[PDB]
Design a protein around this nucleic acid. Sequence first.
RNA 1: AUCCUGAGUACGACGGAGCACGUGAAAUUCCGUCGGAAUCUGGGAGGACCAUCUCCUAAGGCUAAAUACUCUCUAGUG
RNA 2: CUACCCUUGGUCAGGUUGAAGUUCAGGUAACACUGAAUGGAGGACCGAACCGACUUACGUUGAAAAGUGAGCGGAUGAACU
RNA 3: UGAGUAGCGAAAGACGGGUGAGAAUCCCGUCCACCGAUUGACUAAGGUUUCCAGAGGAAGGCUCGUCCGCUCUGGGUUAGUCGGGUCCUAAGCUGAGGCCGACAGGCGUAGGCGAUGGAUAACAGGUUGAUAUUCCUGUACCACCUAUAUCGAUGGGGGGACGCAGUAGGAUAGGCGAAGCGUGCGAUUGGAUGCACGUCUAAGCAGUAAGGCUUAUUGGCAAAUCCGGUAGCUGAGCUGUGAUGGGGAGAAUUCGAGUCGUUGAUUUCACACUGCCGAGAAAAGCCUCUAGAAAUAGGUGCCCGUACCGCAAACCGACACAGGUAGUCAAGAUGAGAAUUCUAAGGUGAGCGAGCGAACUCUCGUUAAGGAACUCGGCAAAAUGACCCCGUAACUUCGGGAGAAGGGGUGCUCUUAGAGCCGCAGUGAAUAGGCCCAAGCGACUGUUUAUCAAAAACACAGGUCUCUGCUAAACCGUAAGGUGAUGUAUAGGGGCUGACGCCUGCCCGGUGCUGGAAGGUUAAGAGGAGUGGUUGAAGCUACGAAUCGAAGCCCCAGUAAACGGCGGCCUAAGGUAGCGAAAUUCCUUGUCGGGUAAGUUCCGACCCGCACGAAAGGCGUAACGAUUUGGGCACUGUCUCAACGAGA
RNA 4: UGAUAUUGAAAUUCGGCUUUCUAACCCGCACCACUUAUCGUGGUGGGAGACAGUGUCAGGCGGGCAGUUUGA
RNA 5: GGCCGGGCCACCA
Lengths: 274, 44
Amino acid sequence: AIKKYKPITNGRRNMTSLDFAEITKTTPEKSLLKPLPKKAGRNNQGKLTVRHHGGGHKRQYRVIDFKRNKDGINAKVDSIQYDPNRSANIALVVYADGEKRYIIAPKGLEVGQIVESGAEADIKVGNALPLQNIPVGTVVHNIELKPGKGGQIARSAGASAQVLGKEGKYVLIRLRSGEVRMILSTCRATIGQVGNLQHELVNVGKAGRSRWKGIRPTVRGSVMNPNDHPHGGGEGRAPIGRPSPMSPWGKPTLGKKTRRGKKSSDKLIVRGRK
Amino acid sequence: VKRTYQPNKRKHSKVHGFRKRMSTKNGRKVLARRRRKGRKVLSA
RNA sequence: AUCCUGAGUACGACGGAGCACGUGAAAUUCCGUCGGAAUCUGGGAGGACCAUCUCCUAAGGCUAAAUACUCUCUAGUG
RNA sequence: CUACCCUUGGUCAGGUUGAAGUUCAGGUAACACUGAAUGGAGGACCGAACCGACUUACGUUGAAAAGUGAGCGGAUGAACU
RNA sequence: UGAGUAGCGAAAGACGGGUGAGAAUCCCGUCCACCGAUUGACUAAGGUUUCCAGAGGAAGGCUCGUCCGCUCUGGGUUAGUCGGGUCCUAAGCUGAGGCCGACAGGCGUAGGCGAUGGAUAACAGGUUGAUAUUCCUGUACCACCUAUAUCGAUGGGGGGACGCAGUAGGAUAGGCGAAGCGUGCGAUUGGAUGCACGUCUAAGCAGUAAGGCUUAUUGGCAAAUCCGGUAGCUGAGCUGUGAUGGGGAGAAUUCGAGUCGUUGAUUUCACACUGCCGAGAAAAGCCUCUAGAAAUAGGUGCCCGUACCGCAAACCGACACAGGUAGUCAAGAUGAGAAUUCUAAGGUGAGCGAGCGAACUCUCGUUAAGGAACUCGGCAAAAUGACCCCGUAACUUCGGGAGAAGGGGUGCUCUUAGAGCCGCAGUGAAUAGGCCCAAGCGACUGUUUAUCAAAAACACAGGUCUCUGCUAAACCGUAAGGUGAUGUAUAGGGGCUGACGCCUGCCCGGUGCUGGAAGGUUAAGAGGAGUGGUUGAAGCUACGAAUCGAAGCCCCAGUAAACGGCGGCCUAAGGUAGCGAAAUUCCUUGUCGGGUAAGUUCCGACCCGCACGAAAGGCGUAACGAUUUGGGCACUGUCUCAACGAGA
RNA sequence: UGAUAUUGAAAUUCGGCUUUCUAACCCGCACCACUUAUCGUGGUGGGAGACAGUGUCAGGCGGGCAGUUUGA
RNA sequence: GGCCGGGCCACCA
Ligand SMILES: [K+]
Ligand SMILES: [K+]
Ligand SMILES: [K+]
Ligand SMILES: [K+]
Ligand SMILES: [K+]
Ligand SMILES: [K+]
Ligand SMILES: [Mg+2]
Ligand SMILES: [Mg+2]
Ligand SMILES: [Mg+2]
Ligand SMILES: [Mg+2]
Ligand SMILES: [Mg+2]
Ligand SMILES: [Mg+2]
Ligand SMILES: [Mg+2]
Ligand SMILES: [Mg+2]
Ligand SMILES: [Mg+2]
Ligand SMILES: [Mg+2]
Ligand SMILES: [Mg+2]
Ligand SMILES: [Mg+2]
Ligand SMILES: [Mg+2]
Ligand SMILES: [Mg+2]
Ligand SMILES: [Mg+2]
Ligand SMILES: [Mg+2]
Ligand SMILES: [Mg+2]
Ligand SMILES: [Mg+2]
Ligand SMILES: [Mg+2]
Ligand SMILES: [Mg+2]
Ligand SMILES: [Mg+2]
Ligand SMILES: [Mg+2]
Ligand SMILES: [Mg+2]
Ligand SMILES: [Mg+2]
Ligand SMILES: [Mg+2]
Ligand SMILES: [Mg+2]
Ligand SMILES: [Mg+2]
Ligand SMILES: [Mg+2]
Ligand SMILES: [Mg+2]
Ligand SMILES: [Mg+2]
Ligand SMILES: [Mg+2]
Ligand SMILES: [Mg+2]
Ligand SMILES: [Mg+2]
Ligand SMILES: [Mg+2]
Ligand SMILES: [Mg+2]
Ligand SMILES: [Mg+2]
Ligand SMILES: [Mg+2]
Ligand SMILES: [Mg+2]
Ligand SMILES: [Mg+2]
Ligand SMILES: [Mg+2]
Ligand SMILES: [Mg+2]
Ligand SMILES: [Mg+2]
Ligand SMILES: [Mg+2]
Ligand SMILES: [Mg+2]
Ligand SMILES: [Mg+2]
Ligand SMILES: [Mg+2]
Ligand SMILES: [Mg+2]
Ligand SMILES: [Mg+2]
Ligand SMILES: [Mg+2]
Ligand SMILES: [Mg+2]
Ligand SMILES: [Mg+2]
Ligand SMILES: [Mg+2]
Ligand SMILES: [Mg+2]
Ligand SMILES: [Mg+2]
Ligand SMILES: [Mg+2]
Ligand SMILES: [Mg+2]
Ligand SMILES: [Mg+2]
Ligand SMILES: [Mg+2]
Ligand SMILES: [Mg+2]
Ligand SMILES: [Mg+2]
Ligand SMILES: [Mg+2]
Ligand SMILES: [Mg+2]
Ligand SMILES: [Mg+2]
Ligand SMILES: [Mg+2]
Ligand SMILES: [Mg+2]
Ligand SMILES: [Mg+2]
Ligand SMILES: [Mg+2]
Ligand SMILES: [Mg+2]
Ligand SMILES: [Mg+2]
Ligand SMILES: [Mg+2]
Ligand SMILES: [Mg+2]
Ligand SMILES: [Mg+2]
Ligand SMILES: [Mg+2]
């Protein structure tokens, strides 16, 4: 659940945190870690191309099996662990042959539970199957967009999608955003909903806690100078002062759609959202 | 108060040294200009 | 004059450039895109264009000299 | 030099307060809930080093092309290096 | 010229003796004084001979100079083990082939380079004018070589291997004491026979150790007896040896004692343990698995750095410049303390002096009576201040406010809390919060105009809108390639608002955005009816209307935490709640009340809002503030009104 | 946003429209090899497909950026 | 001015 701190300081006022009661092991699995140096929003030219990234705690990457391509072998869930690199918790699963892997922790998954993947797997939480063999109405997560590439959709905390129907070589799915779209029937998905549902409930509480997460402060355009931002300048506070609010790079930024035309996925998207 | 020049042998050689000048066409242009003018010192 | 004589070439449209020439009565030369010939009864030019006449024979290549310059060298000059 | 960032190191005399939890003693059908103890949280408090630069005095052909004296803000953090 | 004028760069010196042509300034001595969480000692960077000795005094040195970081001459830096290379990787840089680009070039794979990190064998003593873990002496260790009698990965696995805070312990360094033992001294100032110190000794090699942790079968590219699945290891310190050696308070090359108590780390065990969320490098060295294919003795061990300065007279500041410069060592008295004051170790007396004791300037101390009358403003100063014990309001988000406020105590001696003793005064010095009432702004810690602005400005946690289905959107780049992200709608970008509480009204006509209708309009292109020039014509040539032909625009709808607007019959609609002479009110010192003897400021009201108003948010709001504003207590040379004293 | 080139085969329906196909082109998809390699190239599947992307031409938007004007 | 029913397009003394 959510822990509500007592207002012992002005910083602690209204601050909340996860209690981490689902985390059964507090340290990662050594053989599955990899270094992850920070980019701080800077590209291969050394130039900042995304604002507000930098600093934050040191983090090691956990190698996650998004593919779930180890078919026909049972795996026991050994522990649920904290992953600094994503909003969901992860689960260390041990296969019957001794291979140890990390998977996204589904809601309700428990230590000692047996998960398996493949066309013949049962419809149970944590099992990964092709969308061809998943019944209509099933809630799934970690959905592939291309066969064998690994799950790409519905991976953050609490994420899910529901299977709607089968139309030829595609399966209809309603995604968490509300979009309804077709996905190839050979693409795999995992049964259930991603866990750690209380992740979005955290009241960060203070600026420094944002800093620990690598978020650098955002400066509003209205308090810049005209050579910095379309909203810059003016004496005293100013309203927008042009027909549309603008991004720092000079493009309308309230309601203007940015999805590009003539994409190959237009034929596959039946109903959109966001 | 702290002044602008804080000497550093390594920094000075890596930014202004001979090999750094040879490393780019414009650095080689610098060396050619200094040889043409007749400088005793071509680089660090 | 029986056969041969440089083909995606010449050329044309659109967009440009180079020609003293700013697209103009703009020939003549070149580039991109797209189209695209004729075969000595042939082809090109003579400042739009047509006919006659006149001159030439593209779409392969090579070629000294007269010309440009002086970090230099040798001998000199103002 | 300076701004931001990346990798890898270093530093923060002392004093104060006393969050969550836990134990005990109650209390209960159960659970709330109460008291003591313990516990040691915090961009927490006072205050050296250290980092600043609010006031004032001096300096203004300066000791100094931005400083000095006296107080002053922060000082386990969005810290300083 | 100004002019023998300003200055001569933070400070304590005095005298004796010496040297010399010449001495406040050089050397030596005694006394005095300054620093001492450092003005002491040692590393790093940087400088690059400034280091040492002898000689010198033209110039340099803010004076002098016999002296010198200056000049001349001659010297000085010694490593198998220290730091670096012959080891390892991070960021980053580079990059065979490769991808991309008018050229030049950009990017990138394997690979490589690259410490600020990982690995890694030497300690004690002595010695010089100048070097020393480098030279010498003593005692070691490591790698390789030879001589005299299983090995295995450029493979697998393990390990290396890691945050932050707090707690209780072990041990040791260090401090203090008694003098146990030893070594000096026992003093003409009244007295005593007591005063002053020392009490050490490494690596290595042995032993020990408080502690701390904890059989079978079958995926890791082939195999595994290893790892994975299933049914004992570490460890500060101690003791001995090292060493009948060395060092020693001292005594005359010889001799000279190394113990008891107490305290006890900031060091180490050790990121051991516990807790927490923000979840905390890599690679090699190393161990092991598989495929696969000894001791002893003697010897050998390279390159680079090594002087000196180094919180500065040698570095960065043009200077022998009141500034800047990473780490380490951390004594005594007092104390919570690395605060304070005085001292130790050790260093230093500051590269102009001598007088005088005017004005004036600067720094400092005191001040009758009064006590903010000063002034824009209590600016500055004064006052408060440590510890122990009582006691403590409105308000509140129940944490706070709070050290609220306001009181009391403190010296020394003796007896077991009392009894006394002394002063004007007992935290007797130094250092150590002033407090209260009220209003505006911003919630808060934080950030900002290096060098006239620190704030009410920025940020912020929180809110909302919007974009984005992943080769995401957004962003850098011509591209390749990247960031976003090794993320995936509980995610990422952009706008606005700015904790929290109660809330956030009306208008979609206009503009923007989003979606509809394919009706009008339009380009390239297609389509060729027709015509002019020329040759009755073809033909060549210059033009040329039917019509087909996208988006956009026009049209329709929606959308205001989009841009905006919120009346004077007109409109799209005419301002809801709340607030209001306001950081907004021109008139204006509005009017009334409060506060003062007197109040253009302030507080509370009124509404007549020139010209408030609901996320360019409205109204409140505990806590917070080197913020702005009004009042009060304390307190004072701010003032009446100036006087005296100290220093420059 | 349209035409055209790259750019191919069949149909349906009114020079177009529409559907289907695979073989060009594409895949920051999978596996395989070069090869101890998240680059690249090749191979094989899968996806997509005459679209997309790119060249040329044309119309539109375009203070994002630029050169300038804004009298006496 | 073009075209269509006022709207789009066009206009280098
Ligand atoms: K989370
Ligand atoms: K040395
Ligand atoms: K409107
Ligand atoms: K509208
Ligand atoms: K009013
Ligand atoms: K107003
Ligand atoms: Mg952002
Ligand atoms: Mg902001
Ligand atoms: Mg501004
Ligand atoms: Mg602008
Ligand atoms: Mg503006
Ligand atoms: Mg304004
Ligand atoms: Mg020919
Ligand atoms: Mg031309
Ligand atoms: Mg021409
Ligand atoms: Mg012409
Ligand atoms: Mg021609
Ligand atoms: Mg220290
Ligand atoms: Mg604090
Ligand atoms: Mg410093
Ligand atoms: Mg600053
Ligand atoms: Mg100061
Ligand atoms: Mg404070
Ligand atoms: Mg403080
Ligand atoms: Mg003069
Ligand atoms: Mg005189
Ligand atoms: Mg004068
Ligand atoms: Mg004078
Ligand atoms: Mg004078
Ligand atoms: Mg001086
Ligand atoms: Mg002293
Ligand atoms: Mg010397
Ligand atoms: Mg002199
Ligand atoms: Mg010398
Ligand atoms: Mg490269
Ligand atoms: Mg190329
Ligand atoms: Mg190093
Ligand atoms: Mg020496
Ligand atoms: Mg690790
Ligand atoms: Mg502990
Ligand atoms: Mg200490
Ligand atoms: Mg810790
Ligand atoms: Mg030395
Ligand atoms: Mg010196
Ligand atoms: Mg001096
Ligand atoms: Mg100095
Ligand atoms: Mg300094
Ligand atoms: Mg201490
Ligand atoms: Mg002190
Ligand atoms: Mg008085
Ligand atoms: Mg008096
Ligand atoms: Mg009084
Ligand atoms: Mg007055
Ligand atoms: Mg007055
Ligand atoms: Mg004051
Ligand atoms: Mg005190
Ligand atoms: Mg008393
Ligand atoms: Mg603030
Ligand atoms: Mg602050
Ligand atoms: Mg300033
Ligand atoms: Mg000014
Ligand atoms: Mg200031
Ligand atoms: Mg990437
Ligand atoms: Mg704001
Ligand atoms: Mg506001
Ligand atoms: Mg509104
Ligand atoms: Mg409308
Ligand atoms: Mg059109
Ligand atoms: Mg058209
Ligand atoms: Mg007015
Ligand atoms: Mg008054
Ligand atoms: Mg008022
Ligand atoms: Mg307003
Ligand atoms: Mg608004
Ligand atoms: Mg006062
Ligand atoms: Mg197009
Ligand atoms: Mg402009
Ligand atoms: Mg110009
Ligand atoms: Mg005029």
